[PDB]
Design a protein around this ligand. Structure first.
Ligand SMILES: OC[C@H]1O[C@@H](OC[C@H]2O[C@@H](O)[C@H](O)[C@@H](O)[C@@H]2O)[C@H](O)[C@@H](O)[C@H]1O
Ligand SMILES: [Mg+2]
Ligand SMILES: [Mg+2]
Ligand SMILES: [Mg+2]
Ligand SMILES: [Mg+2]
Ligand code: NA
Ligand code: NA
Ligand code: NA
Ligand code: NA
Ligand code: NA
Ligand code: NA
Lengths: 1015, 211, 174
């Protein structure tokens, strides 16, 4: 029957014998345990060691396995993904389905995981009441047997499947057999851009309920205009035999204080001509001046639902955390508790580099702490309902959640082929309805989402209206079909740009500013995805935040995304390395496109995270004379755990510093008057830095946490006093092949055939391993490469235009190389043409001026042909002989910063170990740049000017040629890149040109100047 | 939904048709017990969607109906929206849950009276003249059933037509109903006679109420 | 399998192997015929004399019936309601369900109509293309077999259920 029916190839069957969905249950038999959320003896975990056997297809599974253990089976930890145990490969594909697109059919070679468990059930559990099993996550479909007898079937990998085991269990030893299919018709709705894995990957448990039971309960909170009064409404449903003596009590608790309580017999109000629900009751509780829930202040109450007898005997209790909050769209603005939200959001997949898609409390808490520490207030469940604990933590720590149905059909042609098909409505409906039934009582959930990237079909409209009808308390959003369809309350585009239109046919992405004011448009706009953080990315992030703050109806967005989906592999010595698509023999695959995070898989931050933190700051600053104006962007809280630290420095040298406590109302302003600042003796630029410090620890941060900062230039005093004339005079030695300049134990050698400084000598020691040459290219970033699907190439991608123009092949040709003797200096003058196939791309004209102080002044003037693609950089590079421990610089830092991602960086004196000047992106590229640098120090060397630099043991060439960070080898000496100019990194998306015009090197002619001396 | 030929005849002879999904759960307590239950959405959806897919090309069909006497449930709202999305060319109506819910483009009561209110709890039947002008109400009113023609009946029929003619937004109604549901039985002389509920040993039954 | 799964007591299963609904088709192979709404040679009626046997429940239906005619069956007109033929009683009830209200379950005593037809198919219909059968109305649910092999299942009494018989039919008698 099971083999004959092939339920995993029928979108009409998504389950057999599955119980109704409901909010989290524990079936407490003690009300105090329910109130305090203590463990329940009636809820038992079946996690731990199970037996497992892998088969190529369900037809290969031997019938004996139903009755007893396969000796060939292994013992494995559950929950798990079986790919993480090496039974078969995980597959990384983005859009293209990992199976032949032939709905509803799946491949006959369908990897089958056979799980089994021998466990004890006590007689007391079977003598009375109902024993159910709960599978919180099984990917992608499964049949269940208990003691040899078929129980049921379930689909949807991301929501719990529950089965009554009461009639299948016996006292003592029992055995479960779970046959998990990798592919099913459910897979057609599970095409999320992530690793394709499978197995029993979330918790398994047993729940005992009495026959007469709470089967469902819903909590609503309604308010008066100023939120000074609330009504808590709790609808409760029962199963079992109705009796006149039955009662329901709902009590509300604030800490250990009961604030309200209501008791009633079962029997609802009349709803129609046939009467009402005899098996339901609605309790209403008045709450005066409730403490309101928000991400700022996650005030929670506890609601306890008791089913009992009139004379006071408890039958069972259930409970949940209650957050008093209202979510509504009014006059085009998303309001929370009557105030317009500014969504500082991120998309977060459930990903672990070791455990695959198995989630644990520790990883969840770590993510929430890092998010809040980095000024995020919201998370999107991309693209499926999460592990139930996630919502509990978001309720308690305070994050706004978009809960999203497990529906994505990206790979269909066209995208709505299934979602417009009424045959797939039943399957889709269960993924929406069962999510709502499970999660509707969580205060952290503020928006429902119909799924991701499934076009726009009539099925979406139907399910949109279903949610609006059963839950008016939360807006519904959905991006598919152009982000502004009739199935969405919020305009929610992905990767719409700030100012630039992208007018794609049928599904255009307008400038977000333009989108708001399209004829007839009234809704708020919140990007469901923006600022694709793939590798060296997040260029232009500040442009989004400037716009969010200026336009009321631009209420923010969710960054894509939180954590890199890299997986751990091991080399021959057991050393771990980060792997991506294609590294598991998985084919076809989309390579590094699974890595888009602000953080590495182990939660180490990318440089981009600090840019996100800074732009998402909750305090804004302005400087007028001696006055700092601090504006609060909080909606509810006073700044009761904040102090402002100010510092004035002169080219990195502290001059004055102080601190003022912040006392700012939400949305309010505070003026801080700086004291008279003492005039500095020396020449240079004075800088003001302010930072907001949290003196006290919180649930989410340590004491001394910095939450905001900002810098301004103050007075500058230009250096007019000339250096005292050095007595020494350098000597020029000319030969046919070289111009040599000597000054004591110092030599500079200029090759006359090439026109470059080919060597420098301090005594008898070489300083250079490679000549100092011009460089106009970079090891391409993920954004430069611009590939979202390994097959497709965009001829407009920067890397493509650079390659086609011959930028990486360009050969320097010497035009001019002359030497002159001045009164107190030697002057070398060079000119080079960079050419590809007859065409001149760049001309570099230089002067090197070497004086008696041993300083080499380099002047560079570059012409770039207007019809060549704008170059990635205009600079010089060399391989230094020296390998030193520290890099010291005056400029923007401390972290990696690029022209379109430097707002978070502060100007100061920074000192780091060499290794910190390299960012270990899993896919290697140009990295570690620091901008706005006036002075750089490394070993014996000093460079001065106004430049950008990176410094490391890896050449651009190695970075360009190496696909994985772990394959990089330290080269001899240190590679230095010093740029007068560097192109933006982009990131608005990572699959088309995304570098804004103001950050492209389009000026045609460029000038920069450097002084190289010995420190 | 009717025999396919019916719509062909209404196209050609000229009758306006309300095409109605095969969904009626009258005997449930309460009436919407199934129609508010997501587990019954799939079965309900097919009764709606397959009707629309069959009959959408017939000019005689001018209004879609979601069924009859199944209360008002969330499944109605979902399917209402489905139709509005796939076929904008026709209004959608449905009487359940008080005749003026969010699942209907037309106020479509059954047996609401001309002048007399019947203020039943939760599902009142207002005077039709009064219903039209309730605070916020703007929709047209067409009775899906009125003038119950059981036996010696149709008293007060003229009162309905006077109101239909006077009030622009009272745009008429559908008499209940066309033909007696009597069945032929044969007595001992072989003579045919008209039979109703109970006459076949069927029990329980509701007797002459099928006529 | 068919007795085991009990598809008629599961609102999750309203059909099996049923084809998508569509507007009325005749599959004319001549355009002038389509224009004038004349009968199509590609649309045949199976109305007329069929074989019928009544059973108190589906468990009482013999397996032999799948293979050959039951001698105890009668020859009856189709389309028909079997109450109008005297096989059991029509029930008139208004509101109260004619069965115990216990969704999704129905009585174990569930009157079962066993219909069969021996009919001819032209060889030209099987050399190319697709031959489907259309039941415009079956009250209230049914399983279908063709030449002893199981085809499908359908619910909803008032809309057509259609099944591809292309792989089940032979030239001549079926
Ligand atoms: O990492 C990408 C991220 O963005 C979202 O869209 C994916 C992207 O895929 C490309 O192949 C298409 O050309 C483009 O239309 C589309 O934006 C997606 O929602 C995320 O889950 C994730 O794939
Ligand atoms: Mg299926
Ligand atoms: Mg996708
Ligand atoms: Mg714990
Ligand atoms: Mg069924
Ligand atoms: Na705004
Ligand atoms: Na991706
Ligand atoms: Na403070
Ligand atoms: Na590379
Ligand atoms: Na009128
Ligand atoms: Na009647």
């Amino acid at each position: 029957v099971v083999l004959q029916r092939r339920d995993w190839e029928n979108p009409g069957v998504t389950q057999l014998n599955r119980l109704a969905a409901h909010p989290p249950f524990a079936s407490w038999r003690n009300s105090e345990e329910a109130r305090t959320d203590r463990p329940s003896q009636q809820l038992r975990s079946l996690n731990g060691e199970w037996r497992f056997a892998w088969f190529p297809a369900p037809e290969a599974v031997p019938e004996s396995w139903l009755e007893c253990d396969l000796p060939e089976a292994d013992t494995v930890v559950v929950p798990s993904n079986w790919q993480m145990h090496g039974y078969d490969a995980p597959i990384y594909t983005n859009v293209t389905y990992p199976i032949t697109v032939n709905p509803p059919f799946v491949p006959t070679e369908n990897p089958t995981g056979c799980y089994s468990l021998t466990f004890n059930v006590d007689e007391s559990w079977l003598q009375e009441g109902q024993t159910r099993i709960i599978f919180d996550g099984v990917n992608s479909a499964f049949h269940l047997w208990c003691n040899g007898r078929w129980v049921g079937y379930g689909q949807d990998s991301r929501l719990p499947s529950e089965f009554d085991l009461s009639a299948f269990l016996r006292a003592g030893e029992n055995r479960l057999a779970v046959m998990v299919l990798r592919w099913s018709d459910g897979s057609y709705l599970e095409d999320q851009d992530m690793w394709r894995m499978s197995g029993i990957f979330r918790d398994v448990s047993l729940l005992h309920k009495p026959t007469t039971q709470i089967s469902d309960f819903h909590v609503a909170t309604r308010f008066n205009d100023d939120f000074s009064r609330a009504v808590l409404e709790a609808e409760v449903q029962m199963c079992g035999e109705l009796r006149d003596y039955l009662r329901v009590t709902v009590s509300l608790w604030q800490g250990e204080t009961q604030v309200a309580s209501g008791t009633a017999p079962f029997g609802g109000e009349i709803i129609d001509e046939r009467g009402g629900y005899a098996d339901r009751v609605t309790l209403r509780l008045n709450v005066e001046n409730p403490k309101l829930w928000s991400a700022e202040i996650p005030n929670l109450y506890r609601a306890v639902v008791e089913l009992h007898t009139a004379d006071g005997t408890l039958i069972e209790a259930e409970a949940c955390d209650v957050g008093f909050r209202e979510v509504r769209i009014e006059n085009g603005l998303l309001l929370l508790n009557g105030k317009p939200l500014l969504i500082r959001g991120v998309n977060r997949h459930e990903h672990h580099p070791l455990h695959g898609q198995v989630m644990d409390e520790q990883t969840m808490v770590q993510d929430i702490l890092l998010m809040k520490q980095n000024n995020f207030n919201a998370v999107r469940c991309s693209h499926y309902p999460n592990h139930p604990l996630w919502y509990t933590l978001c309720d308690r720590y305070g994050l706004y959640v978009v809960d999203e149905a497990n529906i994505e059909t990206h790979g269909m042609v066209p995208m709505n082929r299934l979602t417009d098909d009424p045959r797939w409505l039943p399957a889709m409906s269960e993924r929406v309805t069962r999510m709502v039934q499970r999660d509707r009582n969580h205060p952290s959930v503020i928006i429902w989402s119909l799924g991701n990237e499934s076009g726009h079909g009539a099925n979406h409209d139907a399910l949109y209206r279903w949610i609006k009808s059963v839950d008016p308390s939360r807006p519904v959003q959905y991006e598919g079909g152009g982000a502004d369809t009739t199935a969405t309350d919020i305009i929610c585009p992905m990767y719409a740009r700030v100012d630039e239109d992208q007018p794609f046919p049928a599904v255009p992405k307008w400038s977000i500013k333009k989108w708001l004011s399209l004829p007839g448009e009234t809704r708020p706009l919140i990007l469901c995805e923006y600022a694709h953080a793939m590798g060296n990315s997040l260029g232009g992030f500040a442009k989004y935040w400037q716009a969010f703050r200026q336009y009321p109806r631009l209420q923010g967005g969710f960054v894509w995304d939180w954590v890199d989906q890299s997986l751990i592999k091991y080399d021959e010595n057991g050393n771990p390395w980060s792997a991506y698509g294609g590294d598991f023999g998985d084919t076809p695959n989309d390579r590094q496109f699974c890595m888009n995070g602000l953080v590495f898989a182990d939660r180490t931050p990318h440089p981009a995270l600090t840019e996100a933190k800074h732009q998402q700051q909750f305090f804004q600053f302005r400087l007028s004379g001696q006055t700092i104006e601090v504006t609060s962007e909080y909606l509810f809280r006073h700044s009761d755990n904040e102090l402002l630290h100010w510092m004035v420095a002169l080219d990195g040298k502290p001059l004055a510093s102080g601190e003022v406590p912040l006392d700012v109302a939400p949305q309010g302003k505070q003026l801080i008057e700086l004291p008279e600042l003492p005039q500095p003796e020396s020449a240079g630029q004075l800088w003001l830095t302010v930072r907001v410090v949290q003196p006290n620890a919180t649930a989410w941060s340590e004491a001394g946490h910095i939450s905001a900062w900002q810098q301004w230039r103050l007075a500058e005093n230009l250096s007019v006093t000339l250096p005292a004339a050095s007595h020494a005079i350098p000597h020029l030695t000319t030969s046919e092949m070289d111009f040599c300049i000597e000054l004591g134990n110092k030599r500079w050698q200029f090759n006359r055939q090439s026109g470059f400084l080919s060597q420098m000598w301090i005594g008898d020691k070489k300083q250079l391993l490679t000549p100092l040459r011009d460089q106009f290219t970079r090891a391409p970033l993920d954004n430069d490469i611009a590939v979202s699907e390994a097959t497709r190439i965009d001829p407009n991608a920067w890397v493509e235009r650079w390659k086609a123009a011959g930028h990486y092949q360009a050969e320097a040709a010497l035009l001019q190389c002359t030497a002159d003797t001045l009164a107190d200096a030697v002057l070398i003058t060079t000119a080079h043409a960079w050419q590809h196939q007859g065409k001149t791309l760049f001309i570099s004209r230089k002067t090197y001026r070497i004086d008696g102080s041993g300083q080499m002044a380099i002047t560079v003037d570059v012409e770039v042909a207007s019809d060549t693609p704008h170059p990635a950089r205009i600079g010089l590079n060399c391989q230094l002989a020296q390998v030193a421990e520290r890099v010291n610089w005056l400029g923007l830092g401390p972290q990696e910063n690029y022209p379109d991602r430097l707002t978070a960086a502060c100007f100061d004196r920074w000192d780091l170990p060499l290794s910190d000047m390299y960012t270990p992106y899993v896919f290697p590229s140009e990295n570690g740049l620091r901008c706005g640098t006036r002075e750089l120090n490394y070993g014996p060397h000093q460079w001065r000017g106004d430049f950008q630099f990176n410094i490391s043991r890896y050449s651009q060439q190695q970075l360009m040629e190496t696909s994985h960070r772990h394959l990089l080898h330290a080269e001899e000496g240190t590679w230095l890149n010093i740029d007068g100019f560097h192109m933006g990194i982009g990131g608005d998306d990572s699959w088309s040109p995304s570098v804004s015009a103001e950050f492209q090197l389009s000026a045609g002619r460029y000038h920069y100047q450097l002084v190289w001396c010995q420190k």
